[PDB]
PDB file of C-alpha atoms in Angstrom:
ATOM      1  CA  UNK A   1     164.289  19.389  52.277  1.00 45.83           C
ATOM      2  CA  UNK A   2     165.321  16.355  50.654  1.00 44.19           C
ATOM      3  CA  UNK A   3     165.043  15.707  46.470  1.00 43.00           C
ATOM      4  CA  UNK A   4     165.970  13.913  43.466  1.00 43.66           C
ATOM      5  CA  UNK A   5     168.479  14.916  40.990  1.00 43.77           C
ATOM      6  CA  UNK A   6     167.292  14.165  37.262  1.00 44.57           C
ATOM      7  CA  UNK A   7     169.657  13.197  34.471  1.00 40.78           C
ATOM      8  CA  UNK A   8     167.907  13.417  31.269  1.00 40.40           C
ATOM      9  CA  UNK A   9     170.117  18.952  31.090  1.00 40.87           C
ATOM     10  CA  UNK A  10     169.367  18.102  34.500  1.00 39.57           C
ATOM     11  CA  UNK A  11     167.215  19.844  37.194  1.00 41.92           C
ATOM     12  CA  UNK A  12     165.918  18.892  40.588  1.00 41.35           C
ATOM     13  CA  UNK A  13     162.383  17.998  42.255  1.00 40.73           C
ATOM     14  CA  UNK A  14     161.689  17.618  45.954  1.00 41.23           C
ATOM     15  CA  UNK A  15     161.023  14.091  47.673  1.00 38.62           C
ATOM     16  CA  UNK A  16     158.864  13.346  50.023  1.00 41.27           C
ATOM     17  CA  UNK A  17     158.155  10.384  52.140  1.00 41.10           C
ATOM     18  CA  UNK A  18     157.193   6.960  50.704  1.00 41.31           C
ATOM     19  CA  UNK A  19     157.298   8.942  47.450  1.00 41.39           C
ATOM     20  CA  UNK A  20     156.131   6.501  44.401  1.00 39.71           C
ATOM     21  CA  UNK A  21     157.156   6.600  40.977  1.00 39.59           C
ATOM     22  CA  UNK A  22     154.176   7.958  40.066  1.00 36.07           C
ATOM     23  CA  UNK A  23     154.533  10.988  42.267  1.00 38.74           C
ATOM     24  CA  UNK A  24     158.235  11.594  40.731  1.00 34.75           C
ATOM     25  CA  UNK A  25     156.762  11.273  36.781  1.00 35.67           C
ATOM     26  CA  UNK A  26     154.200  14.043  37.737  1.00 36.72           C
ATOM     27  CA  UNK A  27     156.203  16.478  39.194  1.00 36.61           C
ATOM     28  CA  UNK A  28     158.937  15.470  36.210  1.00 40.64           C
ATOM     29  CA  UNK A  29     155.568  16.252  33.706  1.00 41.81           C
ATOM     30  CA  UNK A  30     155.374  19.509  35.475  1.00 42.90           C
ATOM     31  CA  UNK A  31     158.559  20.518  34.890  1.00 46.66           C
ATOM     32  CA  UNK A  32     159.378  19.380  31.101  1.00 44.39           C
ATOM     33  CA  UNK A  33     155.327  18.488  29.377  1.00 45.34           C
ATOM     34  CA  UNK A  34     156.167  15.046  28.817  1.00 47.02           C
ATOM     35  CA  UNK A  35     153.348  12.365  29.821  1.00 42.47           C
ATOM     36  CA  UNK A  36     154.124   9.803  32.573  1.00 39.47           C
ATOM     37  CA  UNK A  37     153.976   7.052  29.850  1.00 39.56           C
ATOM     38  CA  UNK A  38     156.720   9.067  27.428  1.00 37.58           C
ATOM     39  CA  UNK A  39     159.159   8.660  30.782  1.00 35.73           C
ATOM     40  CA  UNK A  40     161.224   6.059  31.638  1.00 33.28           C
ATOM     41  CA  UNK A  41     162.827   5.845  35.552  1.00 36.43           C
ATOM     42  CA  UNK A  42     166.604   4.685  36.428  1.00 34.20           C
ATOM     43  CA  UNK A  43     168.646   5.155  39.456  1.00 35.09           C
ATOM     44  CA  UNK A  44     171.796   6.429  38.348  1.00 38.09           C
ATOM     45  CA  UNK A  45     175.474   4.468  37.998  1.00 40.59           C
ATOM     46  CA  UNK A  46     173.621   1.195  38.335  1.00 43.24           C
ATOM     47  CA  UNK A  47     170.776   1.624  35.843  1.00 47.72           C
ATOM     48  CA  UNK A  48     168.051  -0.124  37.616  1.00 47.60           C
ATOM     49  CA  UNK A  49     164.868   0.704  35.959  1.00 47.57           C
ATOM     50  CA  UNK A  50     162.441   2.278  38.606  1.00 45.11           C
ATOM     51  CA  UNK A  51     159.160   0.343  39.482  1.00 41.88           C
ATOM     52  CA  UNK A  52     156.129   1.093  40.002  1.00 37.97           C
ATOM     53  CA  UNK A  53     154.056   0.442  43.527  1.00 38.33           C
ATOM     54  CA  UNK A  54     156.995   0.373  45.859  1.00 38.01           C
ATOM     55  CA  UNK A  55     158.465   3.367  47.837  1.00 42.27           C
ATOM     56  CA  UNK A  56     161.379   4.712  45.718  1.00 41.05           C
ATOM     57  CA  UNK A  57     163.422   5.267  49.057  1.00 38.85           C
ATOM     58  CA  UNK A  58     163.070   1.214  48.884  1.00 41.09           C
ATOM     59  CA  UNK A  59     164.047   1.398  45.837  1.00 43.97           C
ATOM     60  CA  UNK A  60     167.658   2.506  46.167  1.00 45.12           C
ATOM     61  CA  UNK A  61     167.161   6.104  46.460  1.00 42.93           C
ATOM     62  CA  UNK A  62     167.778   8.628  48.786  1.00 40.79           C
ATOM     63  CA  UNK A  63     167.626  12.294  49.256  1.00 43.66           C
ATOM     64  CA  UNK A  64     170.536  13.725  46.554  1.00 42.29           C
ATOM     65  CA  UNK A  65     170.208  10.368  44.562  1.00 42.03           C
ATOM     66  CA  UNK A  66     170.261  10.512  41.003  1.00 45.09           C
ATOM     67  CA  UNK A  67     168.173   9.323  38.474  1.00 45.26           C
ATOM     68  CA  UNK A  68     168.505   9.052  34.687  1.00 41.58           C
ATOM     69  CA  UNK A  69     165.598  10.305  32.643  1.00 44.21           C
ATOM     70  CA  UNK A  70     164.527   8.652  29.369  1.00 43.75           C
ATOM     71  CA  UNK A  71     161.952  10.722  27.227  1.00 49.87           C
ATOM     72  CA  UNK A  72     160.485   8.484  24.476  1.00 50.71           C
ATOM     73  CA  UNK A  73     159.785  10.273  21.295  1.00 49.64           C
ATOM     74  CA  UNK A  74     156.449  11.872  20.824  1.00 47.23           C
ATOM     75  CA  UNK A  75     155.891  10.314  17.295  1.00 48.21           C
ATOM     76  CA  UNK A  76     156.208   6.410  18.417  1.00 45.03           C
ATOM     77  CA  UNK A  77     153.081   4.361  18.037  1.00 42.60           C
ATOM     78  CA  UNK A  78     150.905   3.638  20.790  1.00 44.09           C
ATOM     79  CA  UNK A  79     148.849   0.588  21.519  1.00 44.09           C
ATOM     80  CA  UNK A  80     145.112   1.447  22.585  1.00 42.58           C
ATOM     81  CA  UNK A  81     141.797  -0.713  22.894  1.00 38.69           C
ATOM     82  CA  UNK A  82     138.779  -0.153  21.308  1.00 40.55           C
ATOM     83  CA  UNK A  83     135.902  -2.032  23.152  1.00 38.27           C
ATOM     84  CA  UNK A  84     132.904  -2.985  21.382  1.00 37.35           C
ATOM     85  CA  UNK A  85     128.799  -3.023  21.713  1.00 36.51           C
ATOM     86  CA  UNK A  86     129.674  -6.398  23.774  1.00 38.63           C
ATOM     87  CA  UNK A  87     132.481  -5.368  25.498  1.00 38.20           C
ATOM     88  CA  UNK A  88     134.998  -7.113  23.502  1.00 39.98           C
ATOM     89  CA  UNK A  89     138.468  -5.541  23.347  1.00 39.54           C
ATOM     90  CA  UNK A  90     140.498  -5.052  20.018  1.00 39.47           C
ATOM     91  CA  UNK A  91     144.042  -3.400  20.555  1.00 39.30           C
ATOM     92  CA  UNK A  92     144.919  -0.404  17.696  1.00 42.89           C
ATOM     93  CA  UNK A  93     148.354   0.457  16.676  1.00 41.70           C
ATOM     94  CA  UNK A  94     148.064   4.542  16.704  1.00 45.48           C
ATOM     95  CA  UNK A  95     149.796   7.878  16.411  1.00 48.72           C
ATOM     96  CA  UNK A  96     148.813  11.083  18.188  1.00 48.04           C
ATOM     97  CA  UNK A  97     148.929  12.963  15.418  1.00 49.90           C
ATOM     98  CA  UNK A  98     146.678  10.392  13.182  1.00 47.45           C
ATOM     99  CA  UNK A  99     143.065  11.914  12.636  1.00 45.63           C
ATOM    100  CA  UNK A 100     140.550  10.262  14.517  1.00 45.30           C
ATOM    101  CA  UNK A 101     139.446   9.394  10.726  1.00 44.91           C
ATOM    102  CA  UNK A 102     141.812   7.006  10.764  1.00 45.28           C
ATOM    103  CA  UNK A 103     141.488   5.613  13.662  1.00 46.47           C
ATOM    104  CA  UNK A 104     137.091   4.991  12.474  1.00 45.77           C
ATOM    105  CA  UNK A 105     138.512   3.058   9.468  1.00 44.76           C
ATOM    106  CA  UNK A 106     140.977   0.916  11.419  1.00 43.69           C
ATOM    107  CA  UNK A 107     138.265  -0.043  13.809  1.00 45.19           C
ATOM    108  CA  UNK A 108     135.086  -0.313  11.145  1.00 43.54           C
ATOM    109  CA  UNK A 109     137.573  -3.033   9.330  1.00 41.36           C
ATOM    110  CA  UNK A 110     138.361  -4.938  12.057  1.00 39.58           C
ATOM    111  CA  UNK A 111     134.804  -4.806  13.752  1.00 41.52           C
ATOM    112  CA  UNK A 112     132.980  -5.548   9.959  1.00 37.41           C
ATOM    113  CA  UNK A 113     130.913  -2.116  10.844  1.00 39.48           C
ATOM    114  CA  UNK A 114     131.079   0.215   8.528  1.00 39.81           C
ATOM    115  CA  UNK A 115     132.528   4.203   9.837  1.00 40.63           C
ATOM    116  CA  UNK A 116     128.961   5.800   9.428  1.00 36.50           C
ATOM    117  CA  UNK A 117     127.123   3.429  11.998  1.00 39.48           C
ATOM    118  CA  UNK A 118     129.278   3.904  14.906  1.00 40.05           C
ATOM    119  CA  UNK A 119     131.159   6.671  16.693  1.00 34.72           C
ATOM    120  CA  UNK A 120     134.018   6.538  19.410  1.00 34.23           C
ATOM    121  CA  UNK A 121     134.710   8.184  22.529  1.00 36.23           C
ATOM    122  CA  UNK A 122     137.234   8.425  25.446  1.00 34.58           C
ATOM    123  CA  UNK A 123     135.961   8.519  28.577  1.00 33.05           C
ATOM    124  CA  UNK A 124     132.758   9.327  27.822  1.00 31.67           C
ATOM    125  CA  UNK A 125     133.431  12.036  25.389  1.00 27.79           C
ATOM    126  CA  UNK A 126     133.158  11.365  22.090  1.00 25.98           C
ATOM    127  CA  UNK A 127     135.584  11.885  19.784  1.00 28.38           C
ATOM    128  CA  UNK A 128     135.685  14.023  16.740  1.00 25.95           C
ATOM    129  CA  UNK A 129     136.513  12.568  13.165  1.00 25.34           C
ATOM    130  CA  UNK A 130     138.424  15.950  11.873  1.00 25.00           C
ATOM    131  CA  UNK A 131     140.606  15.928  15.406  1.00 25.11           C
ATOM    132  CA  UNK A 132     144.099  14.561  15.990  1.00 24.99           C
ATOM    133  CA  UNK A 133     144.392  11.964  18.786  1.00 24.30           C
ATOM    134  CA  UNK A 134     146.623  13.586  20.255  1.00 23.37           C
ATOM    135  CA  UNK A 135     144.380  15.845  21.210  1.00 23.83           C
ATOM    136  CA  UNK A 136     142.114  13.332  23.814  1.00 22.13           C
ATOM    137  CA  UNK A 137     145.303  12.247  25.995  1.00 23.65           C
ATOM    138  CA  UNK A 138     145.144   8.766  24.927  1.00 25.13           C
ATOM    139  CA  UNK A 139     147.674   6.320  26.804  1.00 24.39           C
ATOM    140  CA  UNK A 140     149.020   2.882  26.290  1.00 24.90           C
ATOM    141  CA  UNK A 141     146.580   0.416  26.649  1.00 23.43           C
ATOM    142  CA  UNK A 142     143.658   2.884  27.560  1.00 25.64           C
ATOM    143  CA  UNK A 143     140.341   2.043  26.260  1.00 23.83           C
ATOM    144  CA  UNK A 144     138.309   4.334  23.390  1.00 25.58           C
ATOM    145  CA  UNK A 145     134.259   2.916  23.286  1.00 26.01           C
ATOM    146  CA  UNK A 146     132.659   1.938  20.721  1.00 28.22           C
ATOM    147  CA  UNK A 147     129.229   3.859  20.143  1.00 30.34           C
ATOM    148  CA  UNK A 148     126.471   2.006  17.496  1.00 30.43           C
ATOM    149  CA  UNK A 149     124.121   4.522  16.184  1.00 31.28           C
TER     150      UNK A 149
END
């Protein structure tokens, strides 16, 4: 029975015990399509920003609390490393909506490779030149793989 009140239009979302921050961005994502790392946490009248790791209830919450909700824009850059044939890390300024085009020419300057003797991929799938970014569910600080040919 008990919840959280969010402030960003405001709705509710049930909390459990020992619930993490993590737990209350998913159900939030549920609720309003925004990715955990668009979201930022606060516990209402006070303005402490929410933490990660630590039980929210710890965290000066309680059933009924409420918290503020800050959406960050979809169109602000995001950081994200591309790791090379040795397993050296480069971080990339990006937008979602960028072609992974760009993206090839960012990394074939900085690596001194040029974009037809590599490819990239996320995860383990690779990632298609004519395709947005957006479209792989890239996060801050996640890691893309450089591929030689």
């Amino acid at each position: 029975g008990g919840y959280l009140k969010v402030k960003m239009n405001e709705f509710q979302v049930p909390m459990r015990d020992s619930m993490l921050l993590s737990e209350l961005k998913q159900l939030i994502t549920q609720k309003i399509q925004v990715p955990a790392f668009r979201q930022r946490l606060l516990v209402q009248g006070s303005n402490e920003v929410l933490q990660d790791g630590v039980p929210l209830a710890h965290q000066g919450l309680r059933s009924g609390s409420e918290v503020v909700l800050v959406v960050q824009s979809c169109d602000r850059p995001l950081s994200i490393l591309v790791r090379n044939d040795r397993g050296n890390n480069r971080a990339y300024e990006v937008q979602l909506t960028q072609k992974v085009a760009r993206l090839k020419e960012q990394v074939a300057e900085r690596e001194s490779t040029n974009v037809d003797q590599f490819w990239l991929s996320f995860q383990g799938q690779p990632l298609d030149d004519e395709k947005q970014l957006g479209e792989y569910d890239l996060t801050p600080h996640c890691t893309v793989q450089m591929n030689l040919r």
